Design a binder for these strands. Structure first.
Lengths: 118, 53, 207, 113, 120
RNA sequence: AACCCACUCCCGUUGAAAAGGUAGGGGAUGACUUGUGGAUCGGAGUGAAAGGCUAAUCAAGCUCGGAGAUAGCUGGUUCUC
RNA sequence: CAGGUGGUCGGGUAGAGAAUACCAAGGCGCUUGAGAGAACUCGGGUGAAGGAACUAGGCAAAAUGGCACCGUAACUUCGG
RNA sequence: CCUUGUCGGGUAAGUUCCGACCUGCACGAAUGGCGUAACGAUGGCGGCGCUGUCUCCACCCGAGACUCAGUGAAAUUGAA
RNA sequence: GAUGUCGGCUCAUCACAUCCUGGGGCUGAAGCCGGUCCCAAGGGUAUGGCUGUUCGCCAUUUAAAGUGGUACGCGAGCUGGGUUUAGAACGUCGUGAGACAGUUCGGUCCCUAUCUGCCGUGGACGUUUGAGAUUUGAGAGGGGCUGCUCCUAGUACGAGAGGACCGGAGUGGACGAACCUCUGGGUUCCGGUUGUCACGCCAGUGGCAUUGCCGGGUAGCUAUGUUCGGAAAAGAUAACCGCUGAAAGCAUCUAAGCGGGAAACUUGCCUCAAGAUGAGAUCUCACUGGGAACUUGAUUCCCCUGAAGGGCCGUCGAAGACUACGACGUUGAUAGGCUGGGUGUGUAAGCGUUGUGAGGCGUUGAGCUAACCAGUACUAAUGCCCGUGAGGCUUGACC
């Protein structure tokens, strides 16, 4: 019925869905522009920004909290050294989503995700 | 279940009268004079007069 | 005549004796009078009453000229009330102060709406078993009609479809407190709708 | 903000600070036979705050060979007094694992003196 | 107790140890019985000698339940275990001494007897 | 447990399948299971026996001849006055 | 084409174990995808207070389950 | 057969079950007659534990049903 | 050249020859109870034991546990216990194959809905110029039940026992609608822990094992929770009770005249309702260009002009299968983020200590916190298409 319920299923089981948004984020903090699907971009913007907010405070406890939800050395190295310092005076709203046509094979509406200053 | 009599030319064509098409979201880019869909990135990669890709 | 409110939430207040009174809190914007329908042009005898604060881009020029015969300068919604005999002239803020403590009232809202409901939820329609040999049909409806002799299904049957955001009134509730400073009516009971809905409060029919 | 502002006026302080795992004693008003009096009810607290959401707790007493438990509303005009006779560490805020155990097994441990 | 075929013990001295509900008295089909209601029991397990023999239709009142009683407050009393008190042909109790607590909610027109012998 | 077998429920019935599947079951050193090669055939074989099996066919296979079998029985029988 | 098809090889950590859970060598992502999150159908998870009242029938589900020691009935072909 | 024969037990209540009577329409001795420990995916009753079987269903997780793009059947049919 | 048979479940609809409640002649009706017959179909109308059973016989209730029709309602809605093909055995009959309107154990229930019938929900057009918003109600539905106490009053009645009518006040049951403040129930938030693989190792943590197995639990949803409802009254009547009164000097409720009269009928209360083609009513807003052809309610074309508005599109919604509805698009708090709270969980890691060690303690109410509240432009809500140009003609009132 979902009155006032938030979050969408995307027809994947919950262990898949956890381990896919961990993997779209870890590729966004390498290339800084991703051509992805439009409902998968509307829910990427609720996973990626508590990584950028977290990066603004360096700590051994924060670098362990960061590693334990985007489990990669290179993404933790890319935060805390470049990002978090570049967005040091931005009160939220770190990304943007630009709709861009449709997929050829299906009609899946696409979107770009892009960091805001680059 | 199956039918008992077949459907004529009239009652077959009446069914598919509600099945037409629509495409109306076309918009002209102010700068480059290129045509694209409203609220979408143009195929040369311009959104509201700014190169993004 | 009644007042158009807005459902805000359920609370609970205590008598100092020890009992609890479940209370539904209703916010009242002061209600302007748009027009006054006399019996001579219109037949019946009624008023128009308006609650405020809609942006001045969404009013059409048909409406914006309609709220300029009286200087109402109106917001969302325009409701009408049929009244016996009274005199309301041009624009007069009808406030909460018509009511007192006691004062059996009627409250009309819509409801929360459930999408497309089966016969068990809709009509309280006890279902077949679960074990003991049963096929795919575990909570489907039963049979519909009789055999050959009516041949048809009979109008008014109880099948399934869309539980309502239909308009429902609850009747004969009582007012616990009237607050003119924060503009509240406190009503003991349940009030139909969701929080943030729209609610009309009439003095009671039966009484 | 409007039911959050009414609910400041019913609340006038009656209770002290306490946790689960405590042995409270509660003085409740008893109106029967046209005379008001008090009554003491002492047991061990197992459920804590905002239990609906307006602040109700729960206390387990071992009566004449028979268990009983009683859920109190905090800001009622019936719950009058509340004193704290003993306190200890439980670690696990809800003690519903004492609806089974009964004797020397249901001793609240004492890390906390 | 609260349904037909609900095993529940007694809170009484003269009686039998366990009884079982067979009929909830009252209306057309009352399905449940709270604290303070008349049920009709069969005697399922008797003490080697008391007063009541095994296998006899009696009448009882319900005095303790694990679902609780609810006063005009949010405040509820909730025991553990179910308990009944047998009655005579007339509704007056059979035994002498009642075991364990009762509630104050039971005291009424006809039940000033058992709340005397109660201690609560 | 491999392995052979088929007691129950539900799903499937235009099936994924002209007899399966997922869960549970029985035997599991022997009156066992099985690979290769051979023997027994149509009023005739085989059978711890059910009228069971003998190439998705069995109270007597499959195929070609006698044969365009016989049908007091059904169905059909075509341009005008 | 979820079926059928004889024989060898068969590592690591726990385990009596070729059972079972995670992995090495090696191999694969089952040749239609994207949405949204109605009834109803299928395969599942938890449940107040009762505890067979269901039904042709406790069918089905739930429960039980290990190793060591203590302890063990009528009955018997004297093994059980 | 008449028949839920009659009598006792078990249940608040027992056309089934257990024990007897014998008035066997129509038991009976190798088409065997009466007993019998251990074994049955065997038939019928009773009990403890246990439970969404049920009073009476409420909620959550997956795969379909629904919408969009690609491909694209079937039985049935005198005419509407 | 097929109309699937008994009982159960689910869902029902009509009759009245009434089981309950409502009104009432007579009684061999003192009172409480009854018996019997006229009027009445509005709402109700039991859980179990035993049997394949309907039926029945029992135990316990209740205001009462109604009798029939609807292929002995209902298998393209369920079951398959009964009759039920192939197996096997008993008793009887036949020399035999075999059989019995005798018993007993075992045994496959097929379908994707084309036409009404429909229950929900939209598209087209219409309503005589076009919009926006609010409405009368023709007509149709929904609902309708009842106990026990207590006062009247232990009064009337009666040897006594026993005990009321009319009226009033309470608070229960069964059914319904709404609603989460409370009392609970409920998977992606926070912990504990088992086996193993990994991140170079120690620490810390993350995969897979049904959510690995469990303890708790916010929002939403929900009942077993919370609140509310069934009227009062008005009309016209049924059975019945009459008042005046003739025909028929009297009598007579009727022929004329005049009343009382029940849950049934019509309003009364809740909802839909102008496709009510009879297409209603109010208030307010918009638009005041030419030209030619052929034929003049003038029709048709050409050109300028496109307003009130609406739609596409975007952000969404306690609205939703799709639609539709509702809120908003920089005139900006519509959704995400951010900053403070609130709630939950149960005192993080790292360091410092204590100890040979697992552990304790300082660390310490710590840290993390989904759906909630308040604020804040940080990111995303950037033209085009439909719709025109003063609204026919007859009559009457009318300068």
């Amino acid at each position: 019925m979902r009155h006032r319920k938030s979050g969408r299923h995307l027809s994947r089981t919950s262990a898949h869905r956890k381990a896919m948004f961990q993997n779209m984020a870890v590729s966004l903090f390498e290339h800084e522009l991703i051509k992805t699907t439009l409902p998968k971009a509307k829910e990427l913007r609720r996973v990626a920004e508590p990584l950028i907010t977290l990066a603004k405070e360096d700590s051994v406890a924060n670098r362990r909290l960061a590693f334990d939800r985007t489990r990669s050395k290179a993404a933790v190295g890319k935060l805390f050294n470049d990002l978090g310092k570049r967005y040091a005076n931005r009160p939220g709203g770190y990304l943007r989503i630009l709709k861009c046509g449709f997929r050829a094979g299906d009609n899946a509406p696409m979107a770009y995700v892009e960091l805001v200053d680059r | 279940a199956v039918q008992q009599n077949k459907k004529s030319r009239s009652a077959r064509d009446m069914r598919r009268s509600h099945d037409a098409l629509e495409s109306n979201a076309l918009s002209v880019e102010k700068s480059t004079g290129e045509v694209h869909l409203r609220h979408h990135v143009s195929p040369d990669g311009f959104y509201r007069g700014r190169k993004v890709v | 005549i009644g007042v158009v409110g807005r459902k805000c939430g359920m609370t609970r207040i205590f008598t100092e004796e020890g009992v609890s009174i479940p209370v539904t809190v209703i916010e009242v914007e002061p209600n302007r009078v748009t027009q006054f329908k006399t019996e001579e042009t219109d037949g019946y005898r009624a008023v128009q009453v308006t609650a405020g604060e809609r942006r001045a881009s969404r009013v059409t020029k048909a409406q914006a000229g309609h709220f300029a015969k009286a200087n109402v300068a109106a917001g969302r919604g325009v409701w009408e009330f049929r009244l016996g005999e009274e005199q309301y002239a041009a624009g007069d803020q009808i406030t909460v102060d018509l009511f007192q403590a006691g004062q059996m009232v009627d409250v009309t809202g819509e409801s929360k709406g459930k999408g497309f409901a089966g016969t068990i939820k809709r009509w309280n329609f006890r279902g077949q078993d679960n074990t003991h040999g049963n096929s795919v049909s575990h909570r489907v409806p039963g049979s519909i009609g009789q055999c050959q002799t009516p041949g048809r299904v009979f109008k008014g049957k109880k099948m399934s479809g869309h539980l309502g955001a239909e308009r429902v009134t609850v009747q004969s509730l009582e007012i616990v407190r009237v607050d003119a400073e924060r503009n509240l009516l406190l009503v003991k009971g349940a009030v139909p709708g969701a929080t943030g809905g729209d609610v009309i409060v009439r003095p009671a029919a039966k009484a | 903000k409007i039911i959050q502002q009414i609910e400041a006026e019913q609340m006038n302080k009656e209770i002290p600070a306490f946790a689960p795992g405590d042995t409270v004693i509660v003085q409740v008003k008893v109106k029967e036979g046209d005379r008001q009096r008090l009554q003491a009810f002492e047991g061990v607290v197992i459920a804590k705050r905002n239990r609906g959401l307006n602040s109700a707790f729960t206390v387990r007493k071992i009566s004449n060979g028979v268990g009983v438990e009683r859920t109190f509303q905090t800001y009622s005009p019936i719950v009058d007094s509340l004193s704290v006779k003993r306190r200890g560490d439980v670690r696990k805020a809800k003690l519903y694992y004492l609806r089974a155990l009964s004797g020397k097994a249901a001793r609240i441990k004492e890390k906390l003196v | 107790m609260i349904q037909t075929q609900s095993m529940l013990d007694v809170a009484d001295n003269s009686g039998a140890r366990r009884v079982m509900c067979i009929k909830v008295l009252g209306g057309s089909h009352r399905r449940y019985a709270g604290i303070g209601d008349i049920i009709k029991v069969t005697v399922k397990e008797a003490i080697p000698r008391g007063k009541v023999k095994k296998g006899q239709v009696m009448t009882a009142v319900v005095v303790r339940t694990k679902h609780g009683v609810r006063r005009t407050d949010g405040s509820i009393i909730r025991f553990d275990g179910n308990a009944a008190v047998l009655l005579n042909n007339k509704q007056e109790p059979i035994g002498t001494r009642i075991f364990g607590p009762v509630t104050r909610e039971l005291r009424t027109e006809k039940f000033m007897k058992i709340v005397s012998l109660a201690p609560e």
